Amino acid sequence: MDSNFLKYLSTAPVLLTVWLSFTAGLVIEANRFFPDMLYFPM
Amino acid sequence: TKFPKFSQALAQDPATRRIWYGLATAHDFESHDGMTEENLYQKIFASHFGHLAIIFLWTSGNLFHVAWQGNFEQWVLNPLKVKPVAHAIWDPHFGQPAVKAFTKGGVFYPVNIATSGVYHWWYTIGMRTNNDLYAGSLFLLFLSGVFLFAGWLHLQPKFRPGLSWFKNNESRLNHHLSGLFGFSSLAWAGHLIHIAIPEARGQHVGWDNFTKTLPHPAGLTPFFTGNWSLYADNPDTANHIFGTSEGSGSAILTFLGGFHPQTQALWLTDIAHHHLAIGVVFIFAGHMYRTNWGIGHSLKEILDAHRPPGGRLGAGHKGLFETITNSLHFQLGLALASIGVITSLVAQHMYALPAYAFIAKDYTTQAALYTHHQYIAGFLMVGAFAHGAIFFVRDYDPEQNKNNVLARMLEHKEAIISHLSWVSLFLGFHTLGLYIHNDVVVAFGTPEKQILVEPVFAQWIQASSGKALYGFDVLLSSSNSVATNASNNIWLPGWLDAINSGKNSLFLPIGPGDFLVHHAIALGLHTTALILVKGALDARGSKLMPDKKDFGYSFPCDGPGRGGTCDISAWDAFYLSMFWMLNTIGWVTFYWHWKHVTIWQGNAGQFNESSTYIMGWLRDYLWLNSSPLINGYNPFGMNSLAVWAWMFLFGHLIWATGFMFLISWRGYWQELIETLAWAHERTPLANLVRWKDKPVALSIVQARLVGLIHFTVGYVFTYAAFVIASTTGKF
Amino acid sequence: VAGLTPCKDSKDFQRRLDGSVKKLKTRLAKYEKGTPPALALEKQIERTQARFERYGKAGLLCGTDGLPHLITDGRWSHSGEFVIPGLFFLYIAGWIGWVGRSYVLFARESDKPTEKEIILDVPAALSFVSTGFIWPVSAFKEFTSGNLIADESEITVSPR
Amino acid sequence: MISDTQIFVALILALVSLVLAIRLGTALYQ
Amino acid sequence: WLRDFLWAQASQVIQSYGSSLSAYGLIFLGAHFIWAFSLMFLFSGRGYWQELIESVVWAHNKLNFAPAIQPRALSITQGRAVGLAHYLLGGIGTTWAFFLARIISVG
Amino acid sequence: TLNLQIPSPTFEGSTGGWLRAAEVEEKYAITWTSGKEQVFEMPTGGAAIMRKGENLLYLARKEQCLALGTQLKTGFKITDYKIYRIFPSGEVQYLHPKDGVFPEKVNAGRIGVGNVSHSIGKNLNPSQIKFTNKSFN
Amino acid sequence: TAVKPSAQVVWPIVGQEVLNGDVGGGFQGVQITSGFFQIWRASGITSEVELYWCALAGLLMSGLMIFAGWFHYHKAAPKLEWFQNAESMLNHHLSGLLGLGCLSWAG
Amino acid sequence: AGYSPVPSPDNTKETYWETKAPSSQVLGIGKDVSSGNYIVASVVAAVVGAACTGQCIPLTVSPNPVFILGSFLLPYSWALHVAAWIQRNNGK
Ligand code: CLA
Ligand code: CLA
Ligand code: CLA
Ligand code: CLA
Ligand code: CLA
Ligand SMILES: CC1=CCCC(C)(C)[C@H]1/C=C/C(C)=C/C=C/C(C)=C/C=C/C=C(C)/C=C/C=C(C)/C=C/C1=C(C)CCCC1(C)C
Ligand SMILES: CC1=C(C/C=C(\C)CCC[C@H](C)CCC[C@H](C)CCCC(C)C)C(=O)c2ccccc2C1=O
Ligand code: SF4
């Protein structure tokens, strides 16, 4: 891959969007498989 | 010109800015031309005399209008049924429908119904006839005259005080603690014993009767024998009809505690004992400081001596004596902060523990009083911080405050401001997040997913005071506790009866909605304090304008250099806090009013369930309760609430008008007024007339102030209407 | 029990469950059986019932409103309501902050720190992201070695 | 219940207070 | 206008929780939030926020770290632009939710 | 000195010109020589044609006069522009090229006004200059 | 006249499935207020197949437009003399673009 | 710098201290009292105040004036023992 394209992908907004999309997916899937968790189960 | 006689820089201005700034700088004596310290202090003294006269005249007018156009004599018979009228209405703009709509007092002329509670206050004091109120108004007119004469006299050459007199701290402190506070409260106890309690028991006692009427059958022998308990024997029965002798006792000083059953207010004997006790305490406190004799302390000695040997405070309180005595702004800030705290305390205690007969059943009066005193409290706190900033700008001497507590505050201002900012962000983030979480889940139809935190800490405090609703059994909820056993035979019976009945506002039951609104209040207080503290500490200088003390307290800006320096003054910090103070007091009063309205209608569950999300506040508090107000007048008629509806819209209007001055800034208006001046000069038959002051746009600081004033007036008038009209239309 | 009643045995909680299920069933009555809307509404009913049952067994307390309330005072019987959740937060947040600070210093000692802050060096960033899992001991080590707290005489401050 | 003579005494006291207020305003304006 | 149009017709959007218009209710509240949030940028100036940032940067420096890109408050023009953008978004979104909820409830 | 007979840059008129305050308080003037007939922008608004030779122009404000001078100096290459102030009494005074040389370059003869012998950090405090005649300098 | 137009469906994640209201026609989704259903009815569309072909045409035109932008910046960029043809551009817009567009739509 | 001199009461001395203990002018009329005297006073005051407080903890409607008066010795004992420490480290 072009190093210039890789630097563009390393630019701040691209990384922020990708990281926050990944985090949103993480939270969404956690809530999809373990929903309605108002508490830690103990 | 000679309008701003105290400033040639303004007298020589060829524009309308001279008039505006002469208005807005009339009372900044320190900045006036050729102002000496003696003249400053003496002018302040005379102005205080005038202000006291104004207050006396205001209260005299209240009494006079209630005596003349009031229904006090027919209100003292059935105070729970008759609405108290403030004053008559004479407006040549009223139609016959409006005159009829405002003749609700059974007086045969249009009237205003008082929301100040002066009726209940005076009835409790001992006023029964209109002649009593008229005599009070006459006396207060006489006192206004006396104080105006005193103010004039103390500006005379041989009566003008000196600065060695103005700066005498010890004698003023002694006299204010002993006589102004202590002996004054002792005299209030004397009044409550000689007039108020006999009047509450149906025995008239006045200037023609109080020298032959014994406040107690035993007279003063129990006092001059040490048998003081004889003044607590035989209190008023629980079946005492206030103002009549049925059920009355003979005790004059008691500590029954709780509320009188019929009046639902504190016992007048308890109030008299309270005032006597605090009177003797204050009299003792007023003997602490040294005066023309050898006994006493010196505040300078105490302040200098108080330095912790560990050195964690540096020089301790060295130099603060001179700082405070020579800075009127330091004293002003201290007084304003203390009075603000005390007026907030007055609001809180006056609702939880009513002192006037039947005031608790006057719902609109109680809400009006609480909102009034909370808004006054917030204004006073903002003023205290503003004058602290002004002191830092004007009266602070670093060399004098070499490494004492004040210089240390300035030293770690960055830590203070950053941590205040962090706590503000903490509270805001998480309170708003919990509210939004509740909103979204309830919107999606899953209210069981709400985060509802029980205010267990406040519930624990209530239980410690003796509330058995929550099961904690701590101190006074516990029957075997030392706290209970210590006071079981003095006040605890009555106090428990008061705390554990749901008929009063004493320690209202609280829940997760109360928790959330309390943390919103915490956010508001912390952010207002953030803005004010940052303004005060950066008033002398920041990294952007490191020479701010040179420019003063309320300069417009420093220009577009260095990135832009809009609102870089401590005055701007005040201007910005005032928005936040209004927000916070709005939150506080919204909370109070909604909780009390729901309790009054008996549907406290509505608050308990809807207070957890903002849609609940918007729908079940504002939208729900604005109906009678907005129906004050309508296409099908009008009622007495029409005035409050009109004032509601009035507040909205002025609020939005202030938005104009706050969003639109000067250059646009200046380039528009230029064209207007051109047009006037160029128009025939109107160029026969010319302005004597060049019409200019408003200044930057002036526009900020005008917008803030419009915003504040809209805020206050809108909420005053809403609260009074909704309370009066619901009950 | 603290000041409220267990939610597993509250008529208010049962009534709320009943109301939710009845709303879903009324919405379902207008859809043919086996159609996507019917299946979706049935799954919604199942999710509601599971949520209410799990809340009941969790040991959550419920007020007169019929909704679970949280006891965030420190009581170990209700740790899972605020404390353990909050410990997980603090762990994640300290991780984020520690790795971010490490990257700030790494970019500080570079040819173009500003270029490194706008166009990131994601290999080093992922390195720090990995390091962040022992942030408590690492941060305390920094503090005690004196690499965390700067001296008062080395931080810019405005004039008094 | 409040007679016109009473209202007139009140007005006279108000006028005296107004005179004193004008005096104080002058002395303060100086 | 206040009673027979705004108060009267806002019932549909304020009573949308638990329905398919609950999104309209939530957007009503969020648009109110953004509209109010604009006033922070519109009623304010740059000096205050630059000084607050100075204090926050002191806090960051006390921990031996701070961005190489020095944090600055928004330019005066940018502060005005942000205030206007949030004002317009909040107002138009409030009207959006109000209109759509009302008309989809009564038609 | 100012010669009131110099022609003007054949302006077509505008509503941005001077007003009664010019006849009552102060009226500024600017004179400059142009090598040809160019089109310049009036500081009040609009276009004007400067003449070949000397041109005299009347304005209400010194800032307008100096903005016109800056335009001439930068856009064109005219730097012989002189600014005067005229009172109703006929007290025409000379302001720009005050000493005949523009202020941006040092010239022998000027006296420093408003110069201070320290940095801004050495200014006194208002508490130190309160109830006194001292200056914060 | 009985089923509410809807062309958006939400996923059932956090209870947002409530937004899939009973629009009608055995379908539950988000009611739409853009008028696309009526546009299609006027256009004579009576199937989802025709709408799929419409979407395909839109995608192909989007690709053509992006390719044209790249080509006319990086491969064949017209000159200022080409751009400054007001008479020709107005002739072509008026006649070709507008006239032929409304002629094709009339057909 | 133009502020008028601040008036202070007569016989106002300098009490500021950076030593281990204040100068014993802080104790005023009791500046010449012995440290042993302060110790004994503090112990006696503490005992008497505690006893008179215990005799009044379940306060009745007719408390004893002497017990009320003596209960104020417990707060007094604190100042007495502070004075004892001050007077021990100032040479006495
Ligand atoms: C008793 C307490 C007290 C005292 C003695 C003073 C004294 C002073 N303050 Mg003030 N101040 C106070 C409380 C007090 N303040 C409070 C509570 C606040 C917080 C709101 C402030 C906030 C404050 C600021 C921010 C400043 C002062 C300043 C001053 C000084 C100049 C006053 C001036 O400019 O007059 C002003 C003269 C006026 C006539 C006021 C006009 C505006 C008022 C608010 C009226 C608006 C209401 C409107 C008329 C109502 C319309 C009704 C509607 C129905 C139509 C002076 C030493 C100024 C100063 O010199 O600082 C160095 C200054 O900058 N004060
Ligand atoms: C509703 C309006 C509003 C809001 C939300 C805020 C928010 C804030 N003000 Mg306030 N302010 C307001 C109106 C408002 N202000 C007005 C009208 C004025 C008068 C001019 C001021 C004047 C003012 C001053 C002078 C100061 C503040 C401060 C603060 C902070 C207080 C602490 C706090 O709550 O942090 C919590 C933060 C929030 C509640 C806002 C977060 C918003 C969302 C929920 C965060 C998530 C964003 C999201 C992911 C973005 C997605 C969108 C994207 C795709 C475009 C915070 C940033 C103080 C400050 O900065 O202290 C640190 C401060 O000094 N304000
Ligand atoms: C409700 C809020 C409000 C109000 C009242 C106004 C009022 C005005 N704006 Mg606007 N403005 C607002 C908000 C508001 N603005 C906001 C938030 C902004 C910021 C974006 C602006 C920004 C702005 C700009 C940039 C401009 C205006 C302009 C105007 C003027 C329009 C024409 C005019 O004079 O009408 C007159 C009518 C009124 C003012 C309505 C109220 C008057 C009532 C009906 C009569 C009451 C008189 C009464 C008898 C007085 C008795 C006094 C005493 C006896 C009690 C006017 C002064 C424009 C302007 O001035 O052009 C001419 C203009 O250029 N405004
Ligand atoms: C799903 C739930 C949730 C969500 C969405 C958030 C969201 C947020 N929290 Mg968190 N929080 C939660 C649950 C949640 N919290 C819970 C349950 C708790 C109780 C333990 C907290 C306690 C908490 C704290 C104490 C703070 C936040 C803060 C924040 C905000 C900034 C966090 C950040 O920048 O991290 C990225 C990390 C960093 C920038 C590093 C520095 C800050 C972290 C938090 C330090 C952690 C380690 C440190 C040693 C902890 C000392 C704490 C002590 C002083 C009390 C953010 C809006 C911060 C805030 O509002 O600041 C204004 C903040 O300081 N939260
Ligand atoms: C970003 C802004 C924006 C957005 C999001 C929308 C969104 C919408 N528009 Mg559009 N619209 C906009 C700006 C926007 N419009 C502007 C600026 C105009 C004025 C030119 C129009 C004119 C317009 C019309 C006339 C119609 C829509 C319709 C619609 C809706 C259906 C979308 C569609 O495919 O229609 C497809 C559009 C059509 C089938 C009608 C096309 C007819 C016009 C006259 C063609 C003009 C083309 C020509 C090249 C434009 C330049 C003219 C100039 C040289 C004089 C939708 C809500 C339609 C609607 O409401 O349907 C219910 C509709 O009939 N819009
Ligand atoms: C007694 C009692 C009864 C029930 C149980 C309880 C535990 C509550 C117990 C104890 C209660 C106690 C200790 C209550 C505490 C209350 C306190 C400390 C209240 C204090 C509030 C402080 C306030 C406003 C401060 C405002 C400060 C301001 C403007 C400062 C302005 C200033 C600035 C900015 C610059 C310098 C000059 C100046 C004027 C100082
Ligand atoms: C609050 C405020 C600030 C402080 C606000 C700042 C510095 C904004 C910085 C916010 C961060 C960096 C944006 C990223 C975080 C947001 C939550 C994400 C949304 C923003 C993007 C969509 C662009 C100013 O600097 C300012 C300047 C001039 C007039 C008014 C104001 C003003 O009101
Ligand atoms: S905008 Fe007005 S205030 Fe802000 S800098 Fe420019 S001039 Fe000063």
- Is residue E41 lining ligand 7, measured as CB closer than 6 Å? yes
Question: How far is CA B546 from its chain centroid?
Answer: 36
User: What whole-number distance in Å separates Cα of residue B402 and Cα of residue B392?
Assistant: 14
Number of other CB atoms surrounding residue H65 within 10 Å: 10
- Distance between CA atoms of residues B205 and B191, nearest Å: 10
The answer to whether B141 contacts D7, with C-beta atoms less than 8 Å apart, is no
**Edge-to-edge order in the sheet of strand C5-6:** C5-6, C61-62, C68-69
Q: Coil, strand, or helix at residue F28?
A: strand
Residue B138 is which amino acid?
L
Q: Does ligand 8 have an atom closer than 6 angstroms to the CB of B600?
A: no
CB of H27 closer than 8 Å to CB of B455: no
Give the number of whichever ligand sits closest to the CA of residue E81: 7
Q: Annotated binding residue at C135? A: no
Question: How close, in Å, is residue A36 to chain C by CA atoms?
Answer: 6
Integer CA distances (angstroms), C18 to B132, C152, D14, in order: 65, 63, 72
- Structure token digits, residue B78: 């059935």
Q: What's the angle, vertex CA B207, arms to CA B86 and CA B138, rounded to 5?
A: 40
CA dist B483 and B487 (Å) reads: 7
Spatial CB neighbours of F59, under 8 Å, sequence gap ≥ 6: F17, F18, F27, F28, F29, F30, F43, F44, F65, F68
Give how far Cα B233 sits from Cα of B186, B249, B277, B289, H62, Å.
21, 8, 18, 38, 11
Sheet holding F82-86, edge to edge: F53-59, F27-34, F82-86, F93-94
- Helical H segments across B557-665, by residue range: 570-601, 604-610, 614-617, 624-625, 627-630, 642-663
Distance separating alpha carbons of residues H45 and H80, to the nearest angstrom: 8
CA dist B505 → B265, B365, B604, B661 (Å): 11, 14, 13, 42
Angle subtended at Cα B370 by Cα B599 and Cα B356, rounded to the nearest 5 degrees: 85
What are the structural domain ranges in chain C? 1-160
Cα gap E21→G30, rounded to integer Å: 9
State in Å: Cα B415 to ligand 8 middle: 29
Question: What's the burial of B462, exposed, middle or buried (CB within 10 Å: 0-12/13-18/19+)?
Answer: buried
Residue from B539, B41, B24 nearest B328 by CA: B41
Under DSSP, the state recorded for B618 is I
E1 by Cβ neighbours in 10 Å (0-12 / 13-18 / 19+) ranks as: exposed
CA dist G14 and C69 (Å) reads 20
For ligand 8, atom 7: residue with the closest CA: B559
Nearest-angstrom CA–CA distance, H55 and H64? 9
Q: One-letter amino acid identity for B317?
A: H
- Name the one residue in this structure whose structure tokens are 């006489």: B142
Side chain identity, residue B141: L
Paired with B297 in beta bridges are B289
Find out whether the beta carbon of B720 lies less than 6 Å from any atom of ligand 1.
Answer: no
Angle between helices D4-29 and B130-153 (to 10 degrees): 20
What the block records as the tokens of C64 is: 């007169």
Q: Tokens representing B676?
A: 């207007």
CA distance F67 to F70: 5
Residues 6+ apart with CB under 8 A from B681: B687, B690, F19, F20
Q: Is G63 exposed, middle or buried (0-12, 13-18, 19+ CB in 10 A)?
A: exposed
Look up residue B198 and give its amino acid.
P
User: How far apart, in whole angstroms, are the C-alpha atoms of residue C99 and residue C97?
Assistant: 6
Burial class (CB in 10 A: 0-12, 13-18, 19+), B477: buried
Structure determined via: cryo-EM
- Encoded tokens for F35: 């090598």
**All chains having 3 or more CB pairs closer than 8 angstroms to chain B:** A, C, D, E, F, G, H
Angle at C32 (CA atoms; ends C30, C34), nearest 5 degrees: 135
Distances (CA, A) of F28 to B322, B670, F18: 55, 22, 9
In this structure, how many other beta carbons lie within 10 angstroms of the beta carbon of residue E37? Answer: 16
Cβ under 8 Å to B: A residues 5-34: none
Terminal-residue alpha carbon distance, chain D: 45
Q: List all residues 6 or more positions away from E102 whose beta carbon is below 8 Å from its beta carbon.
A: E9, E10, E12, E13
- Give residues with Cβ within 8 angstroms of C106, minimum separation 6: C116, C121, C124, C128
CB-CB contact of B499 with B466 (8 Å): yes
The answer to whether the CB of F20 falls within 8 A of the CB of F44 is no
Count contacts between C and G (CB, < 8 Å): 16
Q: What is the dihedral of CA E51, E55, E57, E62, to 10 degrees?
A: 160
SS3 B514: helix
Are E70 and E79 contacting, i.e. CB atoms less than 8 angstroms apart? Answer: no
* Biggest CA-to-CA distance, chain G: 60
Minimal CA–CA distance to B535: which of F87, C24, A22, E55? E55
Residue C69 and residue B452 in contact, taking contact as beta carbons nearer than 8 Å: yes
Tell me how long chain D is: 30
SS3 B134: helix
Helix, strand and coil content of chain H, in percent to the nearest 5, comes to 50, 0, 50
First and final CA of chain A: distance in angstroms? 49
Query: What stretches of C29-155 show up as alpha helix (H) in DSSP?
Result: 36-57, 79-108, 113-118, 122-131, 135-145
Resolution stated for this PDB structure, in Å: 2.7
CB B150 within 8 A of CB B67: no
Query: Where on the phi/psi map is residue B633: left (φ > 0), alpha (ψ -120 to 50), or beta?
Result: beta
Q: How far is the CA of B180 from the centre of ligand 1 (A)?
A: 26
**Sheet hosting strand G6-8, strand order edge to edge:** G6-8, G27-31, G21-24
Q: Which residues contact H38 (CB under 8 A, 6 or more apart)?
A: H30, H80, H81, H83, H84, H87
State CA H88 to chain mean position distance.
15
Closest CA relative to residue B72, chosen from B139, B127, B138, B141: B127
**Residue B516 is which amino acid?**
L
Q: What are the start-end ranges of the E strands in F63-110? A: 82-86, 93-94
Q: Does the beta carbon of G39 lie inside 6 Å of ligand 5?
A: yes
Spatial distance between the Cα atoms of C47 and B676, rounded to a whole number of angstroms: 69
User: Which chains form contacts with chain G, at 3 or more CB pairs under 8 Å?
Assistant: A, B, C, E
Comparing CA positions, the residue from F100, F98, F81 lying closest to residue F32 is F81
H or E stretch covering B111: strand B111-113
For residues F128 and A24, what is the distance between their CA atoms, to the nearest angstrom? 60
The finding on whether E79 has its CB within 6 A of some atom of ligand 7 is: yes
| Measured distance CA(E61)–CA(C141) in Å, rounded | 18
Ligand 2 site residues, Cβ closer than 6 angstroms = B 421, 424-425, 428-429, 432, 523, 527, 530-531, 576, 579; E 33, 36-37, 39-40, 43-44, 48, 52
* DSSP state for residue C119 in the 8-state scheme: B
Backbone φ, ψ for residue B190 (5° rounding)? -60, -45
DSSP secondary structure letters along chain G: --S--EEE----SSSGGGGSEEEETTEEEEE--S-HHHHHHHHT--SHHHHHHHHHHHHHHHHHHHHHHHHHHHT-PPPHHHH--HHHHHHHIIIIIIIIHHHHHH-
**Half-sphere exposure in the Cβ direction for B489 (13 Å, CA):** 10
Task: List Cβ<8 Å contacts ≥24 apart for B232-235.
Answer: B232/B269, B232/H61, B235/B267, B235/B269
Angstroms from B113 CA to nearest CA on chain D:
19
